[PDB]
Design a protein around this ligand. Structure first.
Ligand code: CA
Length: 279
C-alpha cells in the first residue's frame, strides 16, 4: 500500500532516505494486533479511528481525553490518516489527568492493569503498550514497566524531553523496555530529545501531525510523538509475523536505518525505526 502526502514521520518510517512524502506499508496494517495507549485518554469518537478505538480504564472522574495528548499519540499509532498501523485496535488507559499530570502510583496501577487486561481482549497477533510519559528515576515505576514487558506486551516508552541522559528518568531508564528518542525531518536528533545508553531506537518526534480532541488535528513535538511511531511499528511487524512482543525491540533495532542521524552523542545508538517494507 501507498499513502501519498503522508505526514513526514510515516514517510520516514518506510524510507531509506529523508525527504520523501509517501508512506509504504503492507496492507495487513496491524490487523489482529492491539495497542494500549497509556496517557490522557483517547477521543474514541474521532472519525480517524473508524471505531477501532475504545477507552478501557480511567483513574479519574471521566475517561474523556480533556487534554488531547493521548488522542494525538493514539492517532500516530493507528489512525487512518496519521497512523503507522492503520488496522490495529486501540485501547485507552487514562493515567494522566486533563492537565497531563499523574501520580506515579496511578501510572503503576495503569501498567499492571494492562498486563492483566490483555487477557480480556482479542489480540491474536500480539499486544503493544505506548507510554508517552515519564518523570524522575523511580525503581517502582521501572519495575512496573518491566512487569508489563515480562507479561508479554511490547512496551515502548518515551526517552524524555530534557536534552539529557535518560538514565535519570523513568520508565525511560528501565533496561527491558524499548526506550524511544526523537528525530526531526532532516534526520537530526530533536533538540529536546534525551539520549544515553538506555535508548534503544529513535523515531520521528518533531512537528508530528496527528489527531486531536474535538475531532480535530494538530502538529506537536516530543519524544511522546516518537514513541507511538515505534509502538505502531511493533504492532505492524507482529501482524506480519516478523517478531513477537519479547523480541520486537531487538528486531526493530536490528532492522533500523543505521548511522543516519546527526547530533547523536557518543555512546547513544544511531538507529532510526524502519519498516523495511518493499512494495
Ligand atoms: Ca531496552
Amino acid at each position: 500500500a501507498a499513502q501519498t502526502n503522508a505526514p513526514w514521520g510515516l514517510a520516514r518510517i518506510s524510507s531509506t532516505s529523508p525527504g520523501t512524502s509517501t508512506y509504504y506499508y503492507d496492507e495487513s496494517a496491524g490487523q489482529g494486533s492491539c495497542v494500549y495507549v497509556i496517557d490522557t485518554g483517547i477521543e474514541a469518537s474521532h472519525p480517524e479511528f473508524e471505531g477501532r478505538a475504545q477507552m478501557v480504564k480511567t483513574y479519574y472522574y471521566s475517561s474523556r481525553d480533556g487534554n488531547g495528548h493521548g488522542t494525538h499519540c493514539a492517532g500516530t499509532v493507528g489512525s487512518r490518516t496519521y497512523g503507522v498501523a492503520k488496522k490495529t485496535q486501540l485501547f485507552g488507559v487514562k493515567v494522566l489527568d486533563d492537565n497531563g499530570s499523574g501520580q506515579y502510583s496511578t501510572i503503576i496501577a495503569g501498567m499492571d492493569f494492562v498486563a492483566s487486561d490483555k487477557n480480556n481482549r482479542n489480540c491474536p497477533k500480539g499486544v503493544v503498550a505506548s507510554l508517552s510519559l515519564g518523570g524522575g528515576y523511580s525503581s517502582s515505576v521501572n519495575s512496573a514497566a518491566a512487569r508489563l514487558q515480562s507479561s508479554g506486551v511490547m512496551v515502548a516508552v518515551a526517552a524524555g524531553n530534557n536534552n539529557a541522559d535518560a538514565r535519570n528518568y523513568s520508565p525511560a531508564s528501565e533496561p527491558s523496555v524499548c526506550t524511544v528518542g526523537a528525530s526531526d525531518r532532516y534526520d537530526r536528533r530533536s533538540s529536546f530529545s534525551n539520549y544515553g545508553s538506555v535508548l534503544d531506537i529513535f523515531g520521528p518526534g518533531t512537528s508530528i501531525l496527528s489527531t486531536w480532541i474535538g475531532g480535530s488535528t494538530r502538529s506537536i513535538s516530543g519524544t511522546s510523538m516518537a514513541t507511538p511511531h515505534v509502538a505502531g511499528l511493533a504492532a505492524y511487524l507482529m501482524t506480519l509475523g516478523k517478531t513477537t512482543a519479547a523480541s520486537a525491540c531487538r528486531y526493530i533495532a536490528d532492522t533500523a536505518n543505521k548511522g543516519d542521524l546527526s547530533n547523536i552523542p557518543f555512546g547513544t545508538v544511531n538507529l532510526l525505526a524502519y519498516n523495511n517494507y518493499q512494495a
